[PDB]
Nucleic acid binder design. Structure first.
Ligand code: TTP
Ligand code: CA
Ligand code: CA
Ligand code: CA
Ligand code: CA
Ligand code: CA
Ligand code: CA
Ligand code: CA
Ligand code: CA
Length: 903
DNA sequence: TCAGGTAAGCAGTCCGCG
DNA sequence: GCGGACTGCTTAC
């Protein structure tokens, strides 16, 4: 076995490393690492070290790390660049692991934990830790066991032991429904006092020290609470045993409107699952309570209990403990699905960084580029100070608001990384500049050719063509990984649709799901066996295909994010390779590419249709074009098609055999015009969209930039069993829009695109009639809530107070002088409801914490004074009026001459 | 919301617009 | 009532 690190830290002049040795065992070592840094030297001096520009450098070896850091400061005092990796633990990792790391996850101790703290006087603040910790469940991945530490005696109540027998029972038996598959994996430990609980927890921690530490809100709550509680009871030295090197620090996390404190545990990598989820899930949720996310991800029910959480232990300790265990399990279930831990390990080891550094793409790229350059004996530049400056981004075409019946879209593969590779954009490949004409002149191919020697971007930048820069080289590697995983994702998607089709005709038999690899397109033999399977087996296969698709999605989308972030890192002042010339070279090239190809596609289609000056490209955003296919369908005639799938096949063939070759020729010409290193602008068909054949559906519509809806039959080669709505930007897609309203608007859109005006009118009339019956939570708006203090003037709205903030202030007055009432947390999300004139709350709206029922202190009054009329107009009617006006349809039936006959 | 980037939409405040 | 200047928030890319 090849060795690999687990954690690394600098503590004074020592590196502390936990690692897995060549025998598969966990070890710890302290190394008096002597770092090297670099200074420029005369050309006459012999060396093997050169900076990224080819200037010679001398290596300076220091007696210790403090000396190296002190030298950096003196070099600044003198006014000379101090070159090399100034983060010494990254240099240590590079020296110690000078090969591609192959890691074994089964040797890595991943701990998931959750704590309970009974608090009668509000939220138990981690910084204070004034209340006993009365439950800890700690799952260990190596043992595959849930360790449960249960406090039976507290100042807030003495309780009986938790019963595993009752826990396993159905809720209909009075049990807690702790999943049968984890019942045998629970190791239960009751304690008669908190001191013994915490002492045993620390001994346990010492025996089974987490490498990766995760859970839900562990970084902001569980970890600081445990640390501060142990500190309060036993003193600092005991609390620091949570670090394998006995070193901790309070770290201040600063944001624009305040700060918070966390505990850094040296020698542990904390990956709080709430933060993994926010970074890697590509969702925006109305609430981030574990309950809300578990329901969303797993379709598991809410963990139900009576009374407030502050009385749950006292009233129902059995359920209190069971729910603590289930909470830990739900995070593991989410990870089994999403695989964010696996992703973090993959990317961390690839870059050779502390695993927790995967949250920072700048840190990630700094390490990848450093390791790459080091291998060539090249020396990285010193990081410099830069003022933050704005720079231009993508082009977005202004669409004509309208219905659009038949639409085919086309999209460039990994645009920004492909631009970097094509142009050869890198710190060390800058060759100079040329005199820029207006962008319009390059788009229309009338500007003079920028260069006959160098590779160019229309922002004026020129790049070397003799060899790839380090940025293009390293971005290509991660791009290739992304491409592989996307392949697996798309195959699983296509396989899912095969199963959906088979589910139309399930067989009446008892059988089992097929053992197959969903990452690869099903063979003919598998397809034949699938046609003979029962619904139970097919549904099990569908679930497995969809889980495979999710795994592929996680792996691909976040690798996409990583490579895209390199383009943005070039525009971030903290990146070692910050250069607005390079950042702008990327975005400006993108603007040209989109508008260039718009012109080319319009020219091609005008030629094939025999017209002049007609716009076939109706829209584009960044790297995509949307093409009207009405005329293409009309040339064959709608009556000539047997069914919907027939014209979809036809448009698919037209895009692949005629349009893509024309698009490719257009981009190859653009490559020559800019004299680029390599043609990498690959624009493939994305969506085929239209109404069902023979229906009155409108197919699609646009209301404006970044606001449209399409009825899609085929997406990137996936032919759907049922048509799929692609809706971007509209209120159905916004977390701020009430849940039931999202649903209603989506059905309105479905009816518009698939069925027509009359169907839409029927549904509107019904929703308007019935909506007052909807649950208040389902019709509440959602908003993030920043700067509550700023707009608070003695409990009342100050000047320019935002609507959602006004709601919070209203809530605050209504719960005034009440410790048990849920508090709205600064920077978190709230539900918002309008209030009718003359209500007892004394204002036009109220807001409360999202993902929760409003406190019984005011619930019935909120329900009684809810302004349903305002709700409907603002969240439903106004957006719908926008959709229908754009589509040129009416959501209410207009008066006609036939009304004079009504019978 | 500690953690690559810009473009751009809509809600709402404040207040002008004879 | 709408629209501009502005803040706040949220998406598309
Ligand atoms: C989605 C996304 C795009 N972008 C920018 C960079 C992208 O290259 C460009 C186009 O966006 P996309 O077309 O969404 O993504 P992509 O072209 O990089 O990858 P794919 O092969 O899946 O089409 O917009 C971001 O900066 N951040 C993002 O999160
Ligand atoms: Ca809890
Ligand atoms: Ca398990
Ligand atoms: Ca793209
Ligand atoms: Ca594609
Ligand atoms: Ca069948
Ligand atoms: Ca795109
Ligand atoms: Ca795509
Ligand atoms: Ca009441």
């Amino acid at each position: 076995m090849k060795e690999f690190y687990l954690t690394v830290e600098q503590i004074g002049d020592s590196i502390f490393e936990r690692y897995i040795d060549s025998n598969g065992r966990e070890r710890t070592r302290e190394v008096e690492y002597k770092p090297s840094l670099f200074a420029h030297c005369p050309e006459s001096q012999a060396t093997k070290y050169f900076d990224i520009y080819g200037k010679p450098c001398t290596r300076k070896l220091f007696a210790n790390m403090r000396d190296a850091s002190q030298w950096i400061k003196r070099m600044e005092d003198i006014g000379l660049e101090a070159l090399g990796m100034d983060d010494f633990k990254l240099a240590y990792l590079s020296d110690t692991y000078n090969y591609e790391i192959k890691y074994d996850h089964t040797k890595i101790r991943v701990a998931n934990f959750d704590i309970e703290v009974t608090s009668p006087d509000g939220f138990p603040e981690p910084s204070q830790a004034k209340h006993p910790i009365d439950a800890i469940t700690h799952y260990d991945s190596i043992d595959d066991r849930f360790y449960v530490f249960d406090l039976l005696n507290s100042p807030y109540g003495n309780v009986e032991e938790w019963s595993i027998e009752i826990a396993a029972k159905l809720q209909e038996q009075g049990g807690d429904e702790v999943p049968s598959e984890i019942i045998d994996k629970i190791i239960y430990m009751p304690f008669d006092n908190e001191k013994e609980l915490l002492m045993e927890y620390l001994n346990f921690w010492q025996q089974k020290t987490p490498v990766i530490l995760t859970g839900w809100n562990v970084e902001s709550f569980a970890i600081p609470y445990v640390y501060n509680r142990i500190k309060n009871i036993f003193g600092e030295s005991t609390a620091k045993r949570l670090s394998p090197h006995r070193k901790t620090r309070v770290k201040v996390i600063e944001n624009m409107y305040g700060s918070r404190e966390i505990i850094t545990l040296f020698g542990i990598s904390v990956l709080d699952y709430i933060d993994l989820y926010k970074k890697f899930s590509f969702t925006n949720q109305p609430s981030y309570s574990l309950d809300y996310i578990s329901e969303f991800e797993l379709n598991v029910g809410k963990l139900k209990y009576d009374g407030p959480i502050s009385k749950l232990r006292e009233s129902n300790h059995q359920r209190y403990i069971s729910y603590n265990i289930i909470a830990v399990y739900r995070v593991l279930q989410i990870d089994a699905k999403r695989q964010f831990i696996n992703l973090s390990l993959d990317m961390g080891y690839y870059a050779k960084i502390q695993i927790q550094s995967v949250f920072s793409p700048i840190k990630t790229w700094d390490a990848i580029i450093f390791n790459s350059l080091k291998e060539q004996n090249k020396v990285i530049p010193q990081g410099r100070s830069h003022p933050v400056q704005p720079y231009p981004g993508a082009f977005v075409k202004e669409p004509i608001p309208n219905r659009y019946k038949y639409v085919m879209s086309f999209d460039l593969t990994s645009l920004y990384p492909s631009i970097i590779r094509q142009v050869n954009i890198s710190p060390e490949t800058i060759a100079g500049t040329f005199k820029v004409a207006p962008l319009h002149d390059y788009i229309n191919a009338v500007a003079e050719r920028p260069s006959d020697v160098y590779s160019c971007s229309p922002n004026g930048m020129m790049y070397y063509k003799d060899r790839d820069g380090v940025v293009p080289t390293e971005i290509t590697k991660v791009f290739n990984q992304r491409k592989e995983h996307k392949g697996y994702m798309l195959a699983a998607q296509r396989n899912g649709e095969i199963i959906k089709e088979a589910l139309h005709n399930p067989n009446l038999s008892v059988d089992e799901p097929l053992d197959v690899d969903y990452r690869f397109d099903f063979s003919d033999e598998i397809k034949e066996k699938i046609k003979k399977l029962s619904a139970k087996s097919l549904n099990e296969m569908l679930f497995r295909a969809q889980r495979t698709e999710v795994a592929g999605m996680t792996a691909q989308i976040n690798r996409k994010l990583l490579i895209n972030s390199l383009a943005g890192a070039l525009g971030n002042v903290w990146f070692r390779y910050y250069d607005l010339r390079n950042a702008t070279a990327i975005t400006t090239f993108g603007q040209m590419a989109l508008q260039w190809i718009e012109r080319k596609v319009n020219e091609y289609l005008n030629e094939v249709c025999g017209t002049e000056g007609e716009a076939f490209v109706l829209y584009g955003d960044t790297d995509s074009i949307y093409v009207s296919a009405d005329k293409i369908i009309d040339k064959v005639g709608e009556s000539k098609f047997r069914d919907t799938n027939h014209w979809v096949d036809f448009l698919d063939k037209f895009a692949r055999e005629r349009m893509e070759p024309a698009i490719d020729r257009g981009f190859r010409e653009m490559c020559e015009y800019m004299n680029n290193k390599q043609h990498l602008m690959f624009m493939d068909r994305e969506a085929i969209a239209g109404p069902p054949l023979g229906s009155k559906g409108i197919g699609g519509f646009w209301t404006g930039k970044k606001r449209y809806a399409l009825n899609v039959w085929d997406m990137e080669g996936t032919r759907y069993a049922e048509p799929k709505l692609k809706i971007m930007g509209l209120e159905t897609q916004k977390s701020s829009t009430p849940k039931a309203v999202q649903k209603a608007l989506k059905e309105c859109i479905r009816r518009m695109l698939q069925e027509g005006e009359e169907s839409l009118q029927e549904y509107f009339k019904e929703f308007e009639k019935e909506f007052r019956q909807l649950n208040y939570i389902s019709i509440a708006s959602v908003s993030s809530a920043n700067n509550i203090a700023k707009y608070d003037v003695g409990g009342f709205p100050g000047p320019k107070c935002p609507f959602h903030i006004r709601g919070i202030l209203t809530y605050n007055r209504a719960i005034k002088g009440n410790i048990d009432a849920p508090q709205v947390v600064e920077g978190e999300k709230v539900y918002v409801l309008p209030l009718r004139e003359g209500n007892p709350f004394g204002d036009k709206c109220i807001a409360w914490p999202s993902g929760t029922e409003i406190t019984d202190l005011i619930k019935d009054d909120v329900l009684h004074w809810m302004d349903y009329t305002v709700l409907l107009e603002k969240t439903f009617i106004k957006p719908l009026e926008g959709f229908t006006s754009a589509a040129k349809l009416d959501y209410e039936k207009k008066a006609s001459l036939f009304d004079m006959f009504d019978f």
